[PDB]
Design a protein around this ligand. Sequence first.
Ligand SMILES: *[C@@H]1O[C@H](CO)[C@@H](O)[C@H](O)[C@H]1NC(C)=O
Ligand SMILES: *[C@@H]1O[C@H](CO)[C@@H](O)[C@H](O)[C@H]1NC(C)=O
Ligand SMILES: O=Cc1ccc([N+](=O)[O-])cc1
Lengths: 269, 269
Amino acid sequence: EVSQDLFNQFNLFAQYSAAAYCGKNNDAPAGTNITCTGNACPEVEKADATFLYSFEDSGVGDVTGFLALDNTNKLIVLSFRGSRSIENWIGNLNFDLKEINDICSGCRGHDGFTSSWRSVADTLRQKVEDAVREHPDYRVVFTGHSLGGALATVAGADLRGNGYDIDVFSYGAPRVGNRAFAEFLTVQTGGTLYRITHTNDIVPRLPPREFGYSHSSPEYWIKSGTLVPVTRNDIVKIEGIDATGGNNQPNIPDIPAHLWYFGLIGTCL
Amino acid sequence: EVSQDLFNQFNLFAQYSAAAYCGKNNDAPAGTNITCTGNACPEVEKADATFLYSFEDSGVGDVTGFLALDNTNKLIVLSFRGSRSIENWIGNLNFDLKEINDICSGCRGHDGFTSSWRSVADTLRQKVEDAVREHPDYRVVFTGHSLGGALATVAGADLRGNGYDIDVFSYGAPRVGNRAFAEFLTVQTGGTLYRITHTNDIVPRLPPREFGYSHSSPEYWIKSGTLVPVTRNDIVKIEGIDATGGNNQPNIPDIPAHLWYFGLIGTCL
Ligand SMILES: *[C@@H]1O[C@H](CO)[C@@H](O)[C@H](O)[C@H]1NC(C)=O
Ligand SMILES: *[C@@H]1O[C@H](CO)[C@@H](O)[C@H](O)[C@H]1NC(C)=O
Ligand SMILES: O=Cc1ccc([N+](=O)[O-])cc1
């Protein structure tokens, strides 16, 4: 189904995403090697990959994440950590939209994601711009799992078309806003969004459609089970704004499927 | 490096051992199907397997687990759960030996596992005997992970010789007593103890040899990594009491390598 190369990328960015939780990081100076506990990110550890900038509980939304430089793969990576307790995070999830014409006209995003981002966008934009200047050749990639996925997607849409492409790899992301925003996410030039999902993950199903939310297309849907290893065959590309038949299907969703994207994520052994 | 047949058994009882933590109910009526959250025990779910008796915090050691009937595999399974928080347990783990002449002569066992078993021995042995009666041709198997493994090893050594074989499958079990016990564990008749360890898992390294502890022979050492799938080619039988070159290496250990036996164990997604 998907290519080996695109598979390799899916796997690697699943890992930089997992590293935002299990990175033995932060309070860790720039230029330290990136390493995780619990074999959470061995492909990152194999790369000559290092922190550029770490943040923990930044701005209103208490954002957490790292900016990384990878000389092996030629990347600059912005990885957003999802929540420390996904369960309570999902419990307390608020479904309010807020306006964001700044990102695109007619667009409304989950208020809280957009707000948390907005609050750190100036620091982070500057940090990325600095790294793009130092390595104009390197590919810029934003990524995150869960809440992390959300922030990476928002930051993406916000920061694109300033000259450098920004690719986004998201794993188990919630919906981030209205149908207008979803449309912009599906066409927007200057980088690709790879929206990855697994089986019946609960997180991609929130906020629900009924509250005025849509998903971008396409969807990269993993169909091998929780704790099962992923092969190229399982991954199914799915087209259509709010298309069904991937993660968006009418059955009971699952918290454990949220924590298995290529390997363990959202939690550290 | 092990047989397929033995691989399959190791895998099945890793899952019964996982079910002791992830199976939804320690007040679930006898007779109900055995199931787990988070795909922790799909070979179990796949068998006609039911609860016979569920215990929780039982006796002085606060021992938890279940006894099951498996009509597909023709087994009677006693599964001991390890500690609800392994890092703490591992931290507040006492190293004192006690006399246990009742089982082994000149053999000293760990005080807490020994007393914990001893305090629930009578009820549990009654419940196994009842199942052995009703299903005389079923294999009796005691199994456990972590503390769970210590307990199954202790219970096995204690209840053998009553006319039914008891096989023991332990996962990441600590050392359970002194050199005499190790020997008594190596040779005892009336069943087989299958002592499975993983890479540089820390628990099988405790308590230390330097507190008078010895390990029974042999050892089934899983060499494949944390979050990596196990095949029969990844298990090596190591011969000798206190053999080195399996888990018993002078390298440094790891807590995570204690939560991955064939699959996720000792924690539930
Ligand atoms: C960081 O990794 C580089 C290459 O990826 C390696 O040469 C260097 O030894 C590492 N630094 C440390 C402290 O391990
Ligand atoms: C229990 O499993 C048996 C066979 O393994 C099955 O026939 C029966 O439907 C199950 N009971 C429930 C409540 O699922
Ligand atoms: O080939 C090794 C082997 C071991 C055990 C079994 N068996 O138990 O059936 C068969 C083969």
